[PDB]
């Protein structure tokens, strides 16, 4: 997260870290057994870490559960990043409590101008770098379709929204991928792609979760 602030500890209880040796991508818990993330984060073996705040220290609230099943969207496209969404089934259920909680899926798509919260342990710098120990947060608005498509001519599909600031300085980055964009209590975006991070006139682009609720539900019911 560039240009954010350190979240209060355990204040984002649906945030997960995906770990294969190290943190590599975020995710969101959407029920006891299932995490959602980005398909471009795919790896064959993934440990899910719930209840985290500081990813380098054991604090005593964490639950570390291995993935049992990893399912990428069948129409994911590696070139355009369309359908950048993946589901992970945990090998046992997360135990839900004050530090570990589900986020709701969208009841509808969100209006332009809606304020959202973006979170993650990704890079915090542009002209340098530095991956943080502590979870970072960022409030940013959903941008209109026009401001998004003018930024990225020909490359925004109907499954993608822009969230962010056209003046730069504030954005998600490498290592935030797969993590949540939550707006009015509802998961509306997954961190997906961008040109760089926090550049003027190149806001982050996010998978548009309100197009995928049928796919998520059908996949959970079948697996
Ligand atoms: Ca920890």
Are 213 and 106 in contact by the 8 Å Cβ rule? The answer is: yes
Q: Is 54 annotated as a binding residue?
A: yes
Are both 74 and 179 inside the same structural domain?
no
Concatenating the DSSP letter of every residue in 159-215 gives TEEEES-TTSS-B--TTTTT-EEEETTEEEEEEEE-SSSS-TT--EEEEEGGG-HHH
| Candidate list 17, 37, 172, 177, residue with the active-site label | 177
144 is catalytic: no
What torsion do the CA atoms of 218, 77, 33, 115 make, to the nearest 10 degrees? -100
Between the alpha carbon of residue 75 and those of residues 69, 105, 150, the distances in Å are 18, 21, 25
Are both 4 and 91 inside the same structural domain?
no
Are both 176 and 164 inside the same structural domain?
yes
Overall domain count for the chain = 2
Q: What is the resolution of this structure in A?
A: 1.6
Q: Which two structure tokens, joined as six digits, stand for 35?
A: 């995490």
Breaks in the chain, after residue numbers (C to N greater than 2.5 Å): none
| Candidate list 40, 119, 151, 171, residue with the active-site label | 40
Q: Is 62 annotated as a binding residue?
A: yes
CA–CA separation, 35 vs 53, rounded Å? 17
Are both 110 and 88 inside the same structural domain?
no
Q: Which two structure tokens, joined as six digits, stand for 54?
A: 């500081």
Are both 140 and 219 inside the same structural domain?
no
Are both 154 and 95 inside the same structural domain?
no
Are both 55 and 155 inside the same structural domain?
no
What torsion do the CA atoms of 170, 37, 15, 142 make, to the nearest 10 degrees? 40
| Candidate list 82, 84, 171, 176, residue with the active-site label | 84
Are both 111 and 183 inside the same structural domain?
yes
Question: In CATH, what number is assigned to the domain containing residue 108?
Answer: 2.40.10.10
Are both 86 and 49 inside the same structural domain?
yes
Are both 77 and 120 inside the same structural domain?
no
3-state secondary structure string, 28-70? EEEECCEEEECHHHCCCCCEEEECCCECCCCCCCCEEEEEEEE
Domain hosting 88: range is 13-102+211-223
Q: Is 103 annotated as a binding residue?
A: no
84 is catalytic: yes
Are both 217 and 197 inside the same structural domain?
no
Are both 116 and 202 inside the same structural domain?
yes
Q: What is the DSSP letter of 158?
A: T
């Amino acid at each position: 997260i560039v240009g954010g602030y350190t979240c209060a500890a355990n204040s984002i209880p649906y945030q997960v870290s995906l770990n294969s040796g190290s943190h590599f991508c975020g995710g969101s818990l959407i029920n006891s057994q299932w995490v959602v993330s980005a398909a471009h984060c795919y790896k064959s073996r993934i440990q899910v870490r719930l209840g985290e705040h500081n990813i380098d220290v054991l604090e005593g609230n964490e639950q570390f559960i291995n993935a049992a099943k990893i399912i990428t969207h069948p129409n994911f496209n590696g070139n355009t990043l369309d359908n950048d969404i993946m589901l992970i089934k945990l090998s046992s259920p997360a135990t839900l409590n004050s530090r570990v909680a589900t986020v709701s899926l969208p009841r509808s798509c969100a209006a332009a101008g809606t304020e959202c919260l973006i979170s993650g342990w990704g890079n915090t710098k542009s002209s340098g770098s530095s991956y943080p120990s502590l979870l970072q947060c960022l409030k940013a608005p959903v941008l209109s379709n026009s401001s998004c498509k003018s930024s990225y001519p020909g490359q925004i599909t109907g499954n993608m929204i822009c969230v962010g600031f056209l003046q730069g300085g504030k954005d998600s980055c490498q290592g935030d991928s797969g993590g949540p964009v939550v707006c009015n209590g509802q998961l509306q975006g997954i961190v997906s792609w961008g040109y760089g991070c926090a550049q003027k006139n190149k806001p982050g682009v996010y998978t548009k979760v309100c197009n995928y609720v049928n796919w998520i539900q059908q996949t959970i019911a079948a697996n």
